[PDB]
């Protein structure tokens, strides 16, 4: 029968909640109550990158912290040199409904995906000097929402069919399939060791997976609505999630519970992108109200505002050396801030 | 600059920024439309009728899980694009906000099916009152008018039970009925049309509008209807920019 299984699930959930409560001796606020605030963080638009016709849906920083790829729904991937705002590449896409993009750690490849349910891997270092589709990965039965290279041969893609997958670009097959989410998977973030990754979905939950094994180690709840963004802490022991309830939350894996809640009464718009600073002290979050907010990740106090985008901020990211913050928005411009 | 490399970069960018300027000229000259409707609405037949306008190159197989379908048709050299969502899940609250800069949403409903007419009204209401589609206007097609006329004429339908307002309803005076048409058919047609119009008029301010049409099964002028509605939308927006409207 189903009633017995429902009761078993309820009992297991109650036991997990009781264990989490027993492990919650002191809040993060109390521990970090006697720390010096970072003050008002002030940034200026160092660079503005233009050239996209429609809204920019995603972007990713290169490992060299200089080049970045941006995807726009006019059907274009543009690889920029943020130092000089010189366009390095402009790849036209087969399908113009692109919702994600990625940059290989070696810089030899880029990836894109979207409403076509297909993850296209583009080789940037061909012997003929042009950029051609190196591979097309198909098998997802829903729109692709995020993709992150593990290396030049492996890639993790989350789709709207409530599943994520680990692929093999050389063969094009699905090496592993991660299931368990009950809603569209909207974001994923890879650990610095690239052994686990966190996926935040539209069922108001995040899950920590195992790339090598293939099962969900831990499930984190606490959000009220869909989770649009997720980002690992620099040391890999925590992660922040931005959601549609206009709040961000910082969870930690070891405690397996939510540590911090970054919210404001003035803010009633959901979070589209979330990223951390190089030291993890600053949490940057993009909002539908056309602004970005820089929070104190340890005190849960707003520290700065990045304004200057005329439409919804859709992507956000921090260089590998932490030297700049890139924000793209639906007004078709990217901004590099310092 | 320092020449050589810094002259190989700013030139390369100026070779991209030119091609982009060639691409923009074709992106701004085409109109993108989003096709919506239920499985019984008849989007497939409509998109088949308007197809005729207009390593393997002509890949006429797609993929078993495609996700999106493209239909390019040209009316008086305007080159409309129509996008119909394919292999997607039942939940549309996330991928439908990517159609926020689109010339028109073509919503087709099976007007002959009163069993799930409230479902059509419900998702029309959801599309209309959306934060990202609140400036996108809807071209409404009330498909399968011949089936509705046959259902009304043959009797044994009792539309009043699905909508308990057909009793206190009178054909709008502005009715423009075909010379051969029973008054009951006209009453039912305009009742469904006004059911959608009461959703459109309520809220919406004046940034987007609704263009309802009656297209039964053999209307070959649906492409011209879309052309006229898109022309009206574009020039209304242009007037709104100049504060003349």
């Amino acid at each position: 029968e189903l009633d017995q299984l429902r009761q078993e699930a309820e009992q297991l959930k109650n036991q997990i909640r009781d264990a989490r409560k027993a492990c919650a001796d002191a809040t993060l606020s109390q521990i970090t109550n006697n720390i010096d605030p970072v003050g008002r963080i002030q940034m200026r638009t160092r660079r503005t990158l233009r050239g996209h016709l429609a809204k920019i849906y995603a972007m990713h920083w290169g490992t060299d912290s200089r080049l970045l790829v941006s995807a726009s729904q006019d059907g274009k991937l543009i690889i920029w040199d943020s130092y000089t705002t010189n366009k390095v590449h402009a790849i036209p896409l087969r399908s113009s409904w692109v919702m994600t993009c990625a940059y290989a750690p070696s810089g030899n490849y880029v990836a894109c995906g979207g409403l076509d349910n297909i993850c296209s891997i583009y080789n940037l270092k061909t012997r003929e000097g042009n950029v051609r589709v190196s591979r097309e990965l198909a098998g997802h039965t829903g729109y692709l929402s995020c993709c992150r290279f593990l290396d030049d041969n492996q890639i993790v893609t989350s789709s709207g069919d409530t599943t994520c997958a680990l692929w093999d670009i050389e063969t094009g097959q699905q090496t592993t399939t991660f299931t368990g989410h009950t809603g569209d998977v909207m974001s994923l973030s890879l650990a610095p060791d690239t052994r686990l990754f966190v996926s935040g979905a539209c069922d108001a939950s995040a899950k920590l997976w195992d790339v090598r094994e293939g099962m969900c180690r831990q499930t984190f709840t606490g959000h009220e609505s869909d989770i649009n963004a997720i980002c690992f802490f620099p040391n890999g022991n925590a992660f922040a999630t931005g959601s549609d309830d206009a709040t961000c939350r910082l969870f930690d894996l070891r405690a397996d519970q939510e540590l911090m809640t970054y919210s404001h009464d003035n803010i009633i718009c959901g979070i589209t992108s979330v990223s951390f600073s190089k030291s993890g002290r600053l949490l940057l979050a993009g909002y539908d109200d056309f602004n970005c907010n820089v929070w104190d990740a340890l005190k849960a106090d707003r520290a700065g505002v990045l304004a200057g985008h005329d439409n919804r901020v859709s992507c956000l990211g921090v260089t590998d050396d932490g030297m700049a913050v890139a924000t793209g928005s639906w007004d078709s411009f990217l901004k590099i801030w310092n | 600059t320092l020449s050589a490399e810094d002259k190989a970069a700013v030139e390369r960018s100026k070779m991209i920024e030119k091609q982009l300027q060639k691409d923009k000229q074709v992106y701004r000259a085409t109109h993108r439309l989003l096709l919506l409707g239920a499985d019984n609405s008849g989007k497939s037949t409509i998109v088949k009728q308007m197809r005729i306008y207009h390593q393997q190159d002509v890949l006429r197989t797609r993929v078993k899980t495609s996700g999106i379908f493209e239909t390019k048709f040209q009316v008086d050299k305007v080159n409309f694009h129509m996008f119909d969502v394919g292999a997607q899940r039942d939940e549309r609250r996330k991928w439908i906000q990517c159609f926020n800069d689109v010339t028109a949403i073509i919503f087709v409903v099976d007007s002959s099916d009163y069993n799930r007419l409230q479902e059509a009204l419900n998702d029309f209401k959801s599309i209309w009152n959306n934060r990202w589609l609140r400036t996108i206007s809807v071209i409404l097609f009330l498909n399968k008018q011949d089936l509705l006329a046959e259902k009304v004429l043959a009797g044994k339908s009792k539309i009043e039970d699905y909508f308990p307002e057909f009793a206190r309803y009178t054909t709008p005076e502005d009715a423009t009925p075909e010379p051969g048409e029973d008054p009951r058919v006209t009453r039912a047609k305009y009742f469904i049309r006004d059911e959608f119009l009461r959703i459109s008029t309520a809220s919406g301010d004046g940034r987007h509008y609704c263009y309802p049409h009656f297209t039964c099964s053999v209307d070959t002028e649906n492409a011209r209807r879309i052309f006229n509605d898109c022309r009206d939308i574009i020039q209304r927006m242009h007037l709104r920019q100049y504060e003349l409207l």
Partner: nanobody, 126 residues
Framework: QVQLQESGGGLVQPGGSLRLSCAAS????????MNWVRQAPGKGLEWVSD????????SYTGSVKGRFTISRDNAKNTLYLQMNSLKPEDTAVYYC?????????????????????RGQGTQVTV
């Protein structure tokens, strides 16, 4: 953790009155627009009624207009549906659904097959 529990379903003779109560937890009740959605046996899910954040805006489907009354208690975090003059065609599984996002008018995917913020349903047989 968003949770919705429905109660008040049971066997009722035709023409009777049944009150369904929905207790919600894990989210701020006052900030969301709530819905009642029924699924008849052998059919799909059908939207029944909806109530706004403040309880001012109320709407019902055609088949239940004049018979069903939907209300919300924000202080008690509860959603009530009173059903009067039950018909045999009203036998269904009733779910207490929630709009996906707060402070919004569009209730997308509430009638979907695998909606997340929906209750597990209560059976009402006439």
């Amino acid at each position: 953790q968003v949770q919705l529990q429905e109660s008040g379903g049971g066997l009722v003779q035709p023409g009777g009155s049944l009150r369904l109560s929905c207790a919600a937890s894990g989210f701020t009740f006052s900030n969301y627009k709530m819905n009642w959605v029924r699924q008849a046996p052998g059919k799909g899910l059908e939207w029944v009624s909806d109530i706004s954040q403040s309880g001012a805006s109320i709407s019902y489907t055609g088949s239940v207009k004049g018979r069903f009354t939907i209300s919300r208690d924000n202080a008690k975090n509860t959603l009530y549906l009173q059903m009067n003059s039950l018909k045999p065609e009203d036998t269904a599984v009733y779910y207490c659904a929630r709009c996906p996002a707060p402070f919004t008018r569009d209730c997308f995917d509430v009638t979907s097959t695998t909606y997340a913020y929906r209750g597990q349903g209560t059976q009402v047989t006439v």
